[PDB]
Amino acid sequence: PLPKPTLWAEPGSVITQGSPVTLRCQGSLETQEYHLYREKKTALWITRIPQELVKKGQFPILSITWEHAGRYCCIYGSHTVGLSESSDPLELVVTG
């Protein structure tokens, strides 16, 4: 039951439409085993983030749309030493 990671948004969780935002998750080790997800509805855009970013715990959105809004959580963890708990939810809001 590893510690839950820290998930945040840059510049923030409320970003106007068409503008960029990057979701970020940092847990323990340097890199390499992060996973982001949206909970009531799968966020397909996550499955397209290159491994190089995902390994750094980075999930960019260059041009945010309405369908991006939702509740996001993430967990890290290596086969061993094991998977972590879900971070607290991030409310990703889109406006304008």
Residue numbers in the entry: 2 to 97
Sentences from the paper on this structure:
As opposed to Group 2 LILRs, Group 1 members display high sequence similarity and are predicted to bind to HLA class I molecules (HLAIs). Further, LILRA3 is the only non-membrane-bound LILR, and its function was predicted to be antagonistic with HLA-binding Group 1 LILRs. Here, we report the binding properties of the LILRA3 D1 and D1D2 domains to HLAIs (classical HLA-A*0201 and non-classical HLA-G1) as analyzed by BIAcore® surface plasmon resonance (SPR) analysis, as well as the crystal structure of the LILRA3 D1 domain.
The structure is primarily composed of β strands arranged into two anti-parallel β sheets, with one β sheet containing three anti-parallel β strands (A, B and E) and the other containing four anti-parallel β strands (C, F, G and A′). Most of the hydrophobic residues on the strands and the 310 helices face toward the interior of this hydrophobic core, which causes the hydrophilic residues on the adjacent loop region to protrude outside of the core. This hydrophobic core not only contains some important residues for direct binding to HLAIs but also pushes the adjacent hydrophilic residues (e.g., Tyr38, Glu40, Lys41, Lys42 and Glu68) to assume a proper conformation for its binding to HLAIs, unlike the residues of Group 2 members and LILRA2, where the two 310 helices between the C and E strands cannot be seen by helix-strand transitions. There is also a disulfide bond between cysteine residues 26 and 75, which clearly indicates that of the two neighboring cysteines (Cys74 and Cys75) in LILRA3 D1, Cys75 provides the correct conformation for native structure through its disulfide bond between the B and F strands. Some polar interactions may not exist in the LILRA3 D1/HLA-A*0201 complex because the amino acids at positions 36 and 76 were replaced with histidine and isoleucine from arginine (Arg36→His36) and tyrosine (Tyr76→Ile76). Again, the crystal structure of LILRA3 D1 displays that Lys42 forms a hydrogen bond with Glu68 of LILRA3 D1, rendering Lys42 unable to bind to Asp96 of the α3 domain of HLA-A*0201.
